[PDB]
């Protein structure tokens, strides 16, 4: 009965089919068999995409003529897609014919998938609900999201730990060597909650959120014990499966005391352990920083490769900043790339790093940055 | 002897971007390569090699020590782009390595024996010549997407450089289509010809268009187990041979038409890709029904849909299309292979001349009088 007609703008349809995609990428690659729901009604075009973990609803203004719904190949629509010059399409489902999808010159007819086949949306119960700005969504999600676990064995760590402290939201992550925490206050009392978000979900609401259309604005926020439901500037909704698990206590690995504080200017810091952990092998993947109120030297070995040695001076100037406020000298290694991750994840012109001895992590944080938090295990060296 | 020389950093950037290119290998780590760095006569002498090729590198630096050692090309390479300096000092240190020195930067590289690192071999060119390199990128550009892929079939598997009266041409082909491209020597030359490999194709044509390269001359030597490239007289790259006989190509070329398409080459290749879009590996093919009003390229994919496009007969350049018959013509073929010569020939309008739907399309670009180009058709 009902025949799903619209014309669309060509890059707002673009834009939505990358986020319809990219939710359901497994690898770096679309499922050849993942089907895309195109639902035209009261002004609007409901694209929906979904796999066992994930489901993806988004909303765009279009000119609906004829009210329906069809669903089609993701990847093929995508494709084609990002392919026509005309400033506007104009979708119709033809029937056997299929979904036609036409241009000035051309015309695509994809064969349609079934409606009744295709899942909607699970509902959720809430425990918790709040909203925040996407601004500071995306910010506890862009400080913990590169030190969630790899390691799919472990399982609670293969994600990021979405909690309500007090009247503060936090993300948490860990993967058994550093620890990453930052968080927003709330403006409601909320009950205390927690939940372990899955690395993909968490990567995808961030894209999210930081799209141009949505930064701005504001991310609603639905927690229970087996879901979570994003709602990002009204128009878009993520659901999310979690992971069975339990988050570990971090409590305790923050270092409450430090004997020695470096203040150094971030991307000179960066850039230098990124020369110097070039000569390093993966058998043994660790930076020295010998750390003096004069200098600090970071050096590296690599096993039948060679060594590296660069020299900080201490500087009061910005572009060059450096100063270690300790008579005693301390030489500690880190794998660069934990450091690295770190110094990449807050847009600062200096990092503070606060030491006690060589076998006890360090503490870092990024001065206007206060609710950021970030502290990695040393390696022997 | 101990090496020792200042170089400008962005120099030598630039050479180890092709002393690790020119060694990849299937199967082979880049890990496994070394680099010999000679220092003699206010040059630092480069060498890379495989069991494919060998290419000498010279750039010009301030030698403080003459000398020679080796290191890890991928180390080297990589350290040497992550440094801010504009110069850097290279000294062979001995038993501690060469030592790479910028500004409170010291890194050391173990070294290898040179006694350990191949020398070049040399060659007895049946023929010698040089072109431009701006000639010598155009015609590996219009010949290197159209070698066979099939390593077995051998004397397909690679672009054939050969002199033919006055002129050096590319031919390849894969069984499929044929591609020639050409230009006009001055001098005579011996009638000689070699397979160059792939790789080999590949690597040479990005040293000709480098900067540097691309408006000077390459020095081009074939014999009969090699050949050799030096190009802009600080590059020489020694190539071995695919060891086949390249099929004789001329009688494939079509010397009749019964009709003939103009069309804008941009209008057209961005219409065959749009309609491939939905073709499945299995029965990768465009049907072009050609008609004086209209050309409607179209396509199928199982189980995906049908896609058409139509053009309509026009003047205009950005759009132009002029097919010169009554009847009509429906022939196919695999997208990919139009849209290889489309993309090799920056042109604005191309030339498509025709026979029945089992006959091969023979495409030319009347902006480029040495380029000649063949695709069999495939049943639509």
């Given at each position: 009965h009902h025949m799903l007609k619209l014309i669309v703008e060509t890059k707002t349809l673009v834009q939505s089919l990358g986020f319809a995609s990219s939710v359901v990428e497994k690898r770096n690659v679309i499922p050849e068999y993942a089907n895309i729901k195109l639902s035209a009604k009261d002004g609007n075009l409901e694209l929906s995409s979904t796999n066992m973990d994930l489901y993806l609803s988004q909303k765009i203004a279009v000119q609906v003529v004829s009210e329906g719904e069809c669903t089609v190949s993701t990847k093929t629509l995508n494709d084609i897609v990002r392919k026509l010059p005309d400033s506007e399409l104009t979708l119709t489902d033809l029937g056997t014919t299929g979904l036609e999808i036409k241009g000035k010159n051309c015309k695509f007819n994809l064969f349609t998938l079934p409606v009744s086949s295709f899942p909607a949306m699970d509902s959720i119960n809430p425990e918790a609900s709040f909203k925040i700005s996407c601004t500071d969504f995306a910010k506890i999600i862009e400080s913990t999201k590169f030190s969630i676990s790899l390691d799919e064995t472990r399982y609670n760590l293969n994600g990021v730990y979405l909690h309500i402290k007090d009247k503060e939201f936090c993300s948490a992550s860990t993967d058994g060597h550093r620890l990453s925490i930052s968080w927003v206050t709330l403006e409601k009392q909320i009950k205390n909650f927690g939940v372990i978000?899955?690395?993909?979900?968490?990567?995808?609401?961030?894209?999210?959120?930081?799209?141009?259309?949505?930064?701005?604005?504001?991310?609603?926020?639905?927690?229970?014990?087996?879901?979570?439901?994003?709602?990002?500037?009204?128009?878009?909704?993520?659901?999310?499966?979690?992971?069975?698990?339990?988050?570990?206590?971090?409590?305790?690995?923050?270092?409450?005391?430090?004997?020695?504080?470096?203040?150094?200017?971030?991307?000179?810091?960066?850039?230098?352990?990124?020369?110097?952990?070039?000569?390093?092998?993966?058998?043994?993947?660790?930076?020295?920083?010998?750390?003096?109120?004069?200098?600090?030297?970071?050096?590296?070995?690599?096993?039948?490769?060679?060594?590296?040695?660069?020299?900080?001076?201490?500087?009061?100037?910005?572009?060059?900043?450096?100063?270690?406020?300790?008579?005693?000298?301390?030489?500690?290694?880190?794998?660069?790339?934990?450091?690295?991750?770190?110094?990449?994840?807050?847009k600062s012109d200096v990092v503070e790093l606060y030491f006690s001895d060589v076998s006890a992590p360090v503490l870092i944080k990024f001065p206007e940055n206060p609710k950021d938090i970030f502290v990695v295990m040393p390696v022997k060296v």
């Open positions: 978000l899955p690395q993909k979900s968490a990567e995808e609401i961030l894209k999210i959120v930081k799209d141009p259309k949505n930064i701005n604005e504001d991310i609603e926020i639905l927690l229970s014990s087996n879901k979570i439901k994003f709602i990002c500037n009204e128009n878009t909704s993520m659901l999310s499966k979690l992971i069975d698990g339990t988050f570990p206590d971090y409590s305790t690995f923050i270092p409450e005391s430090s004997s020695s504080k470096l203040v150094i200017n971030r991307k000179m810091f960066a850039d230098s352990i990124e020369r110097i952990a070039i000569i390093t092998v993966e058998k043994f993947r660790a930076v020295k920083l010998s750390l003096s109120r004069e200098t600090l030297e970071i050096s590296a070995v690599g096993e039948a490769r060679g060594n590296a040695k660069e020299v900080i001076n201490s500087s009061q100037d910005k572009e060059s900043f450096y100063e270690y406020n300790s008579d005693e000298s301390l030489a500690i290694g880190f794998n660069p790339q934990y450091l690295e991750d770190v110094l990449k994840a807050v």
